[PDB]
């Protein structure tokens, strides 16, 4: 009923931190993302993950990195974690020079394509927009798609919020909840605490009325088959 987290290694935590984009793309610099990246590095380090930070990767570099990691031998590793910090659209995350399909990234780790991760939890944490909606708020033995979890910062169709000084609402909340609860709660319960923190404690402040007083709810997509405990 619980994933075996007893392997000699917890696993890799790959962090892709895209801050600066090619001028031709017209995408803005993502101020505050370094705060996210360092926060995640320390957070996952504490959970005994082998963290690898990568900054400002082209769409080609993203695909290549994911391919290479998926080809590594994860036999002695309990799990796998990938954190993507960038611009995005529905189903898409941006390299510094253009988009990459999230499906193409996650496909490398399918149960049939990454044999040494089969039966192990594969976690993708995505801080990126998923469209342009704003929330105004109110008052074979095993399936190849099994054992993935996707923790999206925001609802499908919606912008995701990042504070230039404090980092993104989602990553801020995720790291805080992991620090506080990773020694006591199952991962889905931790992520539910993250949902509540983002939903209740954050609200945008803008001089632009269109973007002022807006809200955010993250979205957990779980195809996990067992409970995941970090201890």
């Amino acid at each position: 009923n619980s994933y075996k987290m007893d392997y000699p290694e917890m696993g890799l935590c790959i962090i892709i931190n895209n801050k600066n984009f090619h001028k031709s793309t017209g995408m803005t610099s993502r101020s505050g993302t370094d705060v996210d990246a360092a926060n995640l590095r320390e957070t996952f380090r504490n959970l005994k993950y082998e963290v690898r930070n990568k900054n400002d990767l082209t769409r080609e570099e993203i695909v290549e990195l994911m391919r290479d990691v998926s080809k590594e031998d994860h036999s002695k590793r309990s799990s796998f974690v990938c954190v993507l910090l960038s611009h995005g659209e529905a189903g898409i995350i941006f390299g510094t020079n253009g988009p990459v399909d999230l499906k193409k990234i996650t496909n490398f780790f399918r149960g049939d394509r990454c044999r040494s991760l089969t039966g192990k939890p594969k976690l993708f944490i995505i801080q990126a927009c998923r469209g342009t909606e704003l929330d105004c708020g109110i008052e074979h033995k095993i399936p190849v798609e099994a054992d993935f979890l996707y923790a999206y910062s925001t609802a499908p169709g919606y912008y995701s919020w990042r504070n230039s000084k404090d980092g993104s609402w989602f990553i801020q909340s995720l790291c805080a909840m992991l620090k506080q609860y990773a020694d006591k709660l199952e991962f889905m319960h931790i992520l539910t605490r993250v949902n509540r923190k983002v939903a209740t404690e954050f609200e945008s402040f803008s001089f632009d009325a269109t973007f002022h007083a807006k809200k955010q709810i993250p979205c957990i997509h779980s195809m996990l088959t067992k409970e995941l405990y970090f201890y």
């Binding site: 803005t28 101020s31 505050g32 960038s86 990126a128 910062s153 912008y159 995701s160 919020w161 973007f211």
Partner: peptide, 4 residues
């Protein structure tokens, strides 16, 4: 506050 900025959007991604």
């Amino acid at each position: 506050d900025e959007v991604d």
